């Protein structure tokens, strides 16, 4: 995640193993139950896309759901690209590039790039955009997996 250091700057720090394991354990115990979404939200505080793929990729089991989510993440990403067209002409030397759906999904962007966008002024909340897609896709799952 990207956290504030004592000095008063935003720097990246790694997520903790008993945080990781707590994510694992939630999924083990409460599967598709709604409490998973606030839980997720708390444990995703200050998290990167990269950390969010890590969390999704580290799941075991419920592979039908994991595939449905993936496909929701790509749909929501396809929709990001649709709604926000690429911008006019070449990229400025003085500036950094606008993200695509795949940069938001973490796929085409690097960590330093993910830190550029979030730490820069104005900052862009690529975590929160992926977060809604995750929560939206979580609703899809919850609604389906209701019996």
């Amino acid at each position: 995640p990207i956290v504030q250091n004592l000095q008063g700057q935003m720097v990246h720090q790694a997520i903790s193993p008993r945080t990781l394991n707590a994510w694992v354990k939630v999924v083990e115990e409460k599967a598709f139950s709604p409490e998973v979404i606030p839980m997720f939200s708390a444990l995703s505080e200050g998290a990167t896309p990269q950390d969010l793929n890590t969390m999704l990729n580290t799941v075991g089991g419920h592979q039908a759901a994991m595939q449905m989510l993936k496909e929701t993440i790509n749909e929501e990403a396809a929709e990001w690209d649709r709604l926000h067209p690429v911008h006019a002409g070449p990229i400025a030397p003085g500036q950094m590039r606008e993200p695509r759906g795949s940069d938001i999904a973490g796929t085409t962007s690097t960590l330093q790039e993910q830190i550029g966008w979030m730490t820069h002024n104005p900052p862009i909340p690529v975590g929160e955009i992926y977060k809604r897609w995750i929560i939206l896709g979580l609703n899809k799952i919850v609604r389906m997996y209701s019996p």
Partner: protein
């Protein structure tokens, strides 16, 4: 176990089969385009006659929640 060996039982819910499929698909490392080909093809092909019948009625363009709700009573 190979991906071709993944098949749906005569009494096995589709759901339990689809889980097995994306677990084994999860251990395949092929290009995405090939894995898309596997998805639309092999899944239905090794599905049981009763659900297979059902899935043929959904036509093409169908998505996983609709397939999964379509073969629920079977």
């Amino acid at each position: 176990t190979s991906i071709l060996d993944i098949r749906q039982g005569p009494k096995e819910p589709f759901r339990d089969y689809v889980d097995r499929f994306y677990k084994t698909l999860r251990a395949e490392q092929a290009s995405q385009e090939v894995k898309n080909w596997m998805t639309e093809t092999l899944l239905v092909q090794n599905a049981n006659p009763d659900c297979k019948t059902i899935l043929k009625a959904l036509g093409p363009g169908a998505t996983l929640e609709e397939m999964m709700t379509a073969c629920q009573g079977v």
